[PDB]
């Protein structure tokens, strides 16, 4: 539900107030608009290596945090790099949809839970 940013960038709204996190973030935003740009292999392969990245850090801090919600928040980040890990460029126009919204919401509505808790 949450507004797509046209052009696809990071902004403040999306802070986690986690600097390694957030400059991971800003690139996954990135990424997706580089793909969008220039729907290229490597740009594909650079977004699933971004990504693969961020979700290994991040679940390591709320790990270590001993934060309480980490196994439905595992699942979504499993769910989406089985997702993009599957595509190939260049990526047909609904999938790229698809990565732009599913950011936006995972940020929003799922990271946003563990600001201050980790």
Not at 89 to 100: E, G, H, M, Q, S
Request: a negative charge.
């Amino acid at each position: 539900g949450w507004e797509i940013p046209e052009p696809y960038v990071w902004d403040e709204s999306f802070r986690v107030f986690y600097e390694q996190l957030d400059e991971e973030h800003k690139k996954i935003f990135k990424g997706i608009f580089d793909c969008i740009r220039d729907n290229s292999a490597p740009n594909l392969a650079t977004l699933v290596k971004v990504t693969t990245n961020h979700f290994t850090h991040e679940e390591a801090m709320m790990d270590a945090a001993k934060y309480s919600e980490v196994v439905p928040h595992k699942k979504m980040h499993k769910d989406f790099l089985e997702k993009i890990g599957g595509l190939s460029a260049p990526v047909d126009a609904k999938n790229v949809d698809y990565c732009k919204e599913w950011l936006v919401n995972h940020i929003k509505g799922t990271d946003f839970k563990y600001k201050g808790k980790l």
